[PDB]
Structure formats: structure tokens, C-alpha cells
A and B are shown apart, each in its own frame.
With several copies, the nearest count.
Chain A
């Protein structure tokens, strides 16, 4: 797998550093000279080039990369013209960072394989923690079911799993407990619930909220 990242920003630079850490061949492309020099050591190859030019894009050997990431999310003209050239150049996978709803629709028309909203997806996840301080991190399996890593309160201290009727009343399944750095996968009845540690639970979205208000 050969990866090309166009645009070394906060989002683009994180992909280059993470993929290079895992041991992948990453091409870092940016129009700014200072950005390329900073990420020269964090990428296999770093080039100062303009992605809106077809002649400069062909000089990079961009046709040899299966995955090309266009991490430009503040210049719609630069982002949409870059993916038009890549779609014309028959790139199998083009992942684009969008800015707003209208930028999302333009990329969908011109053939974006995946469109990413980094700030919008984090803003929704952060606001879920702001509304309810009991949650720490959640993953939406569907629109009605999710896995929520809850935080143990004072009333749940010194409580066994069998004492909590999550399975019968709330219809939720306890998944894991992070007991002060110790992690137990699929706890068996019964385990004592300690102080403010991570409590992983699984259930319906409305059913977990009932457990937080009543049980927690």
C-alpha cells in the first residue's frame, strides 16, 4: 500500500505521522515550503508542489498510489480541482476533507470515494460529553444502538454486577471495566464496581440514558 497525502495541515499532518509510524510509504504534498520541511522527516517522500496543476501532479508519480488523501478543507477551489485531476487520472481511492455542506455536495458530484468532516464529527462527539459528563467515549453502532464507555459515580461504588439489573430492567449489557488500569473483558457475575473508573456498556440509545439517570 502506497499512500499520498495532499495538504499538510493539522488533519493532513496527523495522517502522515500516523501512517509513517505504522511503516507505510507516504508521499507528503504541500504548496507551503515550511510545511514540507517540517514533515520531511515524518514522510517517506515530501515534495513542494501545487496539486491543482496536472503537470506538477504527474511529476510526482501520483498514478502509482492506490490511496490519495486530499486534506484541504479551507480552500474549496483547491480541493475540488485537485480531486477532479485525480478522478481523471483513475485513482482507485480518493478521500477528501470537506469544509461545509455545500463542499460535501460538490465532491460527491465529481466522484469522491469518501468525504471526511474531521471538525464536525469531533464537535458532535464533544458535545455529547458536554451534555452528559458521565460518558467518556462512545461509538454509534447504528442510529438507535451504541457502545458507551461510562464513568462510575459514587452510588455505584462497592456494587456487584448482579446487583445492577441492567440485563433485565434496562436491557443493557456490561462489556468491560477498567479497574484503575486493570481491564477485564466480559466480566462474570459478580464483580465489585469501584470508584470513578471506565465502565463500558452496550444497549439501546434511550436505554443507556435511563441507566445513567436512575442506576448511575
Chain B
């Protein structure tokens, strides 16, 4: 039932958001019922897939609704639910505290209400500061009326890992700009590192006092971004479409930006449709892995990938247990990561299979769209504006399951089987 409240509440925000975006006040042009549903779903799932341009189709009021859906969806439905109850004066019950444990993927209810206070105060603080830093650049280019709103829209979009951009070119005019690159990359890296990871760094200022999850995220993200930066820079160095007609300083900025954006922000500085096939394949594995168990990102998490990878290597080396940072990992942790990865690949496989039946498109664009939609990244190769009515409905389901997580979606309609009986062991050869 705590997974059922998450599924119902998250789906209702799509319906409420779709009505608000379909009003004539919130848009400058007539909008389809599916495009209004797609834009609302792409905001609460915080994906960033846009059939229609955000800057042109929607008004200032319409883009304000987008910021509301991004902020609600990025922090989670139950994050703001506790705040409303706390403001009204009602105390948090045991039943209400169990909903927070399921929403934040916590193993215990110990100190989970206070985590919501920290993560919400940290979210509004760092989005306000980043808007001020972006204000020194966006105001002289777009005045005071549009410059302040563009900084506020992008600071919320970047921190929540959305990828929404008001400009027709999604950050393609700021490839060599260090102000836009450094501030925005600082937002989704810290916004995607995990609320528990941020809470541990705030209270503990020494690396040896960090938990296993905090040390895994800090070391894992640094290693994964370094490999991704080298892979993009080497493969795209001679590419004429992207990273070719740029200076060496501008090559380092775009390679660094494209290394960290697929997890899971979905901003860009180079056209992904003109990249080589080798970089797209590496991006597929890059955006299949997310960042942070309790964060604004989606897909399988970085800790999930490390736990599975170390468990296989330990088996290949003959070790009897999974040991990371001189800490043993128990069997329930292994089987949960096994359940996340297999269910995620099964849903992605069904999405690719369903889109190939419906959409008439190159196969590389179909696979790129499905991995981006499931990971809630939003990177496109040129397929989202070309999707049919049936194709868009598949992506909405993929984005919905990807943000909520494959386990919580299944647990909504999977009745628990509580039996204490056992069975004799059977031998089956799995070579």
C-alpha cells in the first residue's frame, strides 16, 4: 500500500498538470491532448523530452506550471506532502512516516522525517544561489524581465535533472561559456549525487567517517565522469559535425559537459544526431546508469551498477563474498540490485520492441529514445518531434515507470506471497 500511494499520487500530478497546460492562458498556440499529456508527463517524471518547444508554445504562466511540475516531480510527491502536513500543524504519524521510507528508498524509518527537512531546505537554497550566479550572465543578454526568469527556470531545471530549456537550442549557444557550464554541471551533479550523500557530507567533513554508500557515490561518480570525458573527447575529436570546428579550450568544455549530462540531466552542447555511432553506444550504457538512490535522477543507480559488477568479479576471482571498501555486502542487497537491473532491461526491451512496431525510424534512434525515456534523461537524436500518437503513449508509460522505479511500479499491483513453507533443493545446470 505505501507503493500504491506513490503510484496513485504521482499519476494524479500528470492529470492535474495536463489540464493546466491545456488551458488557453498557459499556451500561445493550440495544443493537442497528447502533447499536453506528454509535456506534463515529461515534467513530473523530470525527463525533458519535448514534442513542442517550451519557449514558444507556452506563455510565462505556462512555463511557471512547468517549474511547479519539475519541482514537485524532482523532489518527489511525498517530499512536499510532509511539508504541507507540518505547516498545517498536524503531527507525522507512523503510517505517514512509512510512506517517506518507501519514497526515499530508505531501509529504516530512523531519522527520515528530518531528512526531508534538510533536503527541501537545501534544494530551495542552492536553486536560489545558482539563480543569482546565472543572473550575472542572463540579465545583460535578455534584460531584467526575461533574464531573471531564464536563470530561475534553468536553476530549477538543472538541479532537478530535467534538461528543459526555454531557448530553441538547448544550451548549444553556450559551448565555450564557463559561467553556464560550471554552474549548471554543479547543479545536476550535486542534485543527482543523492540526498543521503549530501546529508552525510554536511554533517561529516572527513572522508574516513563517510558511510559505504557515500564513499561509493563520491568515488564512483568521479571515476565514471573521467572515463566518459576521455571516451567522448577521443571519439569525437575528428568528427566534423560535433567537436571538430572548435578550439581546444572549447573541446574540453563540450567533452566535459557531454560526459556528465546523460546522468541524468539531458542538457547538451553538441548535436547528438550528428555524433558517431561509437559515442552513442557508450552513452546508452552511460544513461542506463543513473546517480544516487534518493536523488532527482532515475534509471538503475550507480550503487546498483557497482554492487552487481563487484559481485560478478568476486565470483570470477573465486571470492565467497562481495567486498567494497573493506565492507561485506549481504545477500538482500545483492538480490535487490539483481531485481532492479533485470526488470529495467525487460521494460526497456519492451519499449524498443513496441516502438519498432509503431514508429518508422532508424533503429539507433529508437534505442536511444527508449534508454533516454526510461532513465529520464531527455537526450534526443531527432525522434521525439517525429513520434506518432501511439508512439508518444508508449514513451509516457516508459517515463512513468522509469521515474517511479521498476520495483515500486510492480509492487503496486503485485500481491505479497507470505508463506513459511519450504521445498527440497533441485539441481539445475545454469552453465
Contacts and interface: CB of A to CB of B under 8 A. Distances in A.
Check whether chain A touches chain B (CB < 8 angstroms).
yes
Interface of A: 2, 25, 27, 33, 36-37, 40, 44-50, 53, 55-56, 58-61, 64
A55 to B, nearest CB: 7
Contacts of B111: 58, 61
A189 B424 CA distance: 60
A181 to B, nearest CB: 33
9 contacts: A2-B94, A33-B422, A46-B326, A47-B423, A60-B110, A61-B94, A61-B97, A61-B109, A64-B94
A168 B4 CA distance: 68
Contacts of B418: 37, 55
A37 B425 contact: yes
Interface of B (DSSP majority class): loop
Interface string B362-399: 00000000000000000000000000000000000000
Contacts of B109: 45, 59-61
Nearest to A44: B94
Nearest to A38: B424
Interface string B180-208: 00000000000000000000000000001
A60 B421 CA distance: 8
A44 B96 CA distance: 11
Interface residues of B, number: 23
B94 A25 contact: yes
Contacts of B423: 36, 46-48
A46 B424 contact: yes
A50 B425 CA distance: 17
A212 B419 CA distance: 56
A40 B418 CA distance: 11
Contacts of A49: 420-422
B108 interface: yes
Nearest to B109: A61
A206 to B, nearest CB: 49
Nearest to B326: A45
A48 to B, nearest CB: 4
B93 interface: yes
A156 to B, nearest CB: 49
A64 B92 contact: yes
Interface in B85-115: 92-95, 97-98, 108-113
Nearest to A4: B94
Interface string B63-94: 00000000000000000000000000000111
B420 A55 contact: yes
Contacts of A61: 94, 97, 109-113
Nearest to B108: A59
Interface in B216-264: none
Nearest to B209: A41
Contacts of B419: 55-56, 59
A120 B34 CA distance: 71
A20 B208 CA distance: 12
A50 B94 contact: no
Given A45-B326, A61-B111, A25 B424 contact: no
A40 B112 CA distance: 22
Contacts of A59: 108-110, 419-421
Contacts of A36: 422-424
B324 to A, nearest CB: 14
B424 A37 contact: yes
A40 B95 CA distance: 14
B97 A56 contact: no
B214 to A, nearest CB: 14
B318 to A, nearest CB: 12
Nearest to B211: A41
Contacts of A44: 94-95, 208
Contacts of B94: 2, 25, 27, 44-45, 61, 64
B424 A40 contact: yes
Contacts of B98: 45
A40 B425 CA distance: 9
Most chain A CB within a 10 A radius of its CB, from B94, B95, B110, B420: B94
Q: Which of B98, B111, B422, B424 neighbours the largest number of chain A CB atoms within 10 Å of its CB?
A: B424
Nearest to A25: B94
Given A45-B326, A58-B110, A64 B421 contact: no
A50 B419 CA distance: 11
Pick the 6 closest A-B CB pairs, nearest first: A59-B110, A48-B422, A59-B108, A25-B94, A40-B424, A49-B421
Nearest to B97: A61
A50 B418 CA distance: 15
A91 to B, nearest CB: 15
Given A45-B326, A60-B109, A2 B422 contact: no
A47 B110 contact: no
Contacts of B421: 47-49, 56, 59-60
Nearest to A48: B422
A60 B98 CA distance: 11
Contacts of B113: 61, 64
